[PDB]
């Protein structure tokens, strides 16, 4: 049983940019494909498009700094803001 990587995340850095040192650990290209596929198959496209508009329009009114952090993860991985938001809320969606 190996130990996971141990990485620092600075809360002094911008929310959108503080997770990048961690995102470069795993293969980001493989992570984008894995997220885009699994969210694509379980969530229809029309729902995802609506989820995107709501989150982007009401970014100021959703909890922080989590939403701005999900915005920076999805931008780095070239995911739709809906894709990044659905995976981060995968527990509640169940």
């Amino acid at each position: 049983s190996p130990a996971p990587p141990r990485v620092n995340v600075s809360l002094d850095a911008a929310p959108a940019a503080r997770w990048l040192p961690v995102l470069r650990l795993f293969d980001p290209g493989l992570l984008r494909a894995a997220v885009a596929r699994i969210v694509g198959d379980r969530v229809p496209k029309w729902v995802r498009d609506v989820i995107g508009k709501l989150v982007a329009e009401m970014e100021s009114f959703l909890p922080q700094p989590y939403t701005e952090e999900i915005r920076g993860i999805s931008d780095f991985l070239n995911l739709s803001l809906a894709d990044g938001f659905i995976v981060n809320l995968a527990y509640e969606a169940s």
Binding site: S1, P2, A3, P4, P5, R6, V7, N8, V9, S10, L11, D12, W19, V22, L23, L25, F26, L31, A34, V35, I38, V47, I51, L54, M58, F61, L62, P63, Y66, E69, I70, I73, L77, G84, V87, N88, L89, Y91, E92, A93
Partner: protein, 232 residues
């Protein structure tokens, strides 16, 4: 999931948890131990997955440790969910991380985890730095259904939480509670330690095919925070 908060014969608090989740083939590769830095210091430590901003396992050094287990709720619509987000409700993993970032001490963290409204049900297991500082907080969306504390002076030196309410019998099909109690019963209060608790969390079926990682921790000894990937 299996979380355990326990107390040894000296008054030291130990906290451990197993994270079981399907798709674990992928998650095991994405598990990281994150140290969140603030103002040139380690504000808190957490175990998460790449791309996930919440914490299901975390530590506030010399203050408290927290882990979250899943609780089955009423059917929730995705429309009602977004409403809950805008209504002001919080995801269960985001409250854990907020508490680790804001709460000043153990008792204040238990208050935050118990009262804050949530989008879904959950179990919050919290451990502290002083004797008797251990609780299993059974949560509804609205508030606390129960608060199960450690009672060492009466022989209850450990609390075990799986994914079912502790005052009801567990399903015969998914009974990971009694083997975790048997292993803790066999270990004994005097022999309890982080490594002895890791051994308990390595027992089958407490550790099974879908287990992703195991964490043992104690806010009083924050340097001993250790996570292990399982079935890798």
């Amino acid at each position: 999931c299996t979380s355990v908060v326990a107390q040894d014969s000296r008054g030291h608090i130990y906290h451990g948890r197993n994270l079981d989740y399907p798709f674990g083939d992928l998650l095991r590769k994405m598990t990281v131990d994150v140290q969140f830095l603030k103002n040139g210091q380690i504000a808190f430590t957490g175990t998460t997955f790449i791309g996930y901003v919440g914490l299901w396992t975390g530590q506030s050094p010399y203050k408290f440790t927290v882990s979250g287990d899943e609780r089955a709720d009423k059917g929730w619509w995705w429309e009602n969910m977004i409403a809950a987000l805008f209504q002001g409700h919080s995801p269960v993993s985001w409250l854990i991380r907020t508490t680790l970032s804001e709460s000043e001490d153990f008792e204040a963290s238990v208050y935050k985890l118990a009262k804050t409204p949530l989008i879904a049900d959950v179990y919050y297991i919290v451990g502290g730095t002083a004797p008797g500082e251990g609780v299993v907080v059974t949560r509804n969306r609205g508030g606390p259904a129960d608060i199960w504390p450690l009672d060492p002076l009466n022989g209850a030196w450990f609390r075990v939480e799986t994914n079912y309410d502790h005052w009801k019998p567990v399903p015969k099909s998914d009974d990971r509670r009694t083997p975790a109690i048997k292993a803790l019963n066999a270990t004994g209060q005097a022999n309890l330690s982080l490594e002895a608790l890791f051994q308990v969390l390595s027992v089958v079926p407490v550790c099974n095919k879908i287990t992703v990682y195991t964490t043992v921790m104690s806010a009083a000894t924050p340097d001993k925070y250790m996570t292990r990937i399982r079935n890798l």
